Design a protein around this nucleic acid. Structure first.
Length: 187
DNA sequence: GCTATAAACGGGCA
DNA sequence: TGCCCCTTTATAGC
């Protein structure tokens, strides 16, 4: 439990990685769809072949421009590992795929701070950043500015941390908010 | 299922 | 440029 990087003693667990990659060749989406079993394609709803693999369980959206977005992994390494497996698939189906400019694009994390949270008290004294309409959505949307991270804060004490590009942004965001959430420990 | 968040992609409207 | 979609993921109330 590394105290320096996380004085709270709680580390958020990563829940979803969104990465993209440039295969750098033009693809026949219809041919890929016919020859692949794990690939769906309806171009009149969405211009991407949706491919899914089980290990690591991820979903790829592959486009005729040769751009691919990989989604569903729970680590950046698993995102790159999955993105490679997709690129080898299209290679074996007869396309000169490359692996150019792989970039994590969005990381989703979550954790628990163990204590219930008085949401109405935080939505008031942090009205500049908070948006809390419980009849619409039971969590309050907290828009942190440095780092530019959105937090979903719930009464139970569970929080969602989104919008980060690097996991250190997720870790830094959680602990800019933890001493805040401590002031609103519900009785 | 709906409601809420972020991101990339291609694509509709303006 | 803006608006709206598009997939995924945690969270949670109806």
């Amino acid at each position: 439990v590394d105290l320096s990087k996380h004085p709270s003693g709680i580390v958020p667990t990563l829940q979803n990685i969104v990465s993209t990659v440039n295969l750098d060749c033009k693809l026949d989406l219809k041919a890929i769809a016919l020859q692949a079993r794990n690939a769906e394609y309806n171009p009149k709803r969405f211009a991407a072949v949706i491919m899914r693999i089980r290990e690591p369980k991820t979903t790829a959206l592959i486009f005729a421009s040769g751009k691919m977005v990989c989604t569903g992994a729970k680590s950046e390494d698993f995102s790159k590992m999955a993105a490679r497996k997709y690129a080898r698939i299209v290679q074996k189906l007869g396309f000169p795929a490359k692996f150019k400019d792989f970039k994590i694009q969005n990381i989703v994390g979550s954790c628990d701070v163990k204590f219930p949270i008085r949401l109405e008290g935080l939505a008031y004294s942090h009205a500049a950043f908070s948006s809390y309409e419980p009849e619409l959505f039971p969590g309050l949307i907290y828009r942190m500015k440095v780092p530019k991270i959105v937090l979903l804060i719930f009464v139970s004490g569970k929080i969602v941390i989104t919008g980060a590009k690097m996991r250190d942004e997720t870790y830094k965001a959680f602990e800019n908010i933890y001493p805040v959430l401590s002031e609103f420990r519900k009785i």
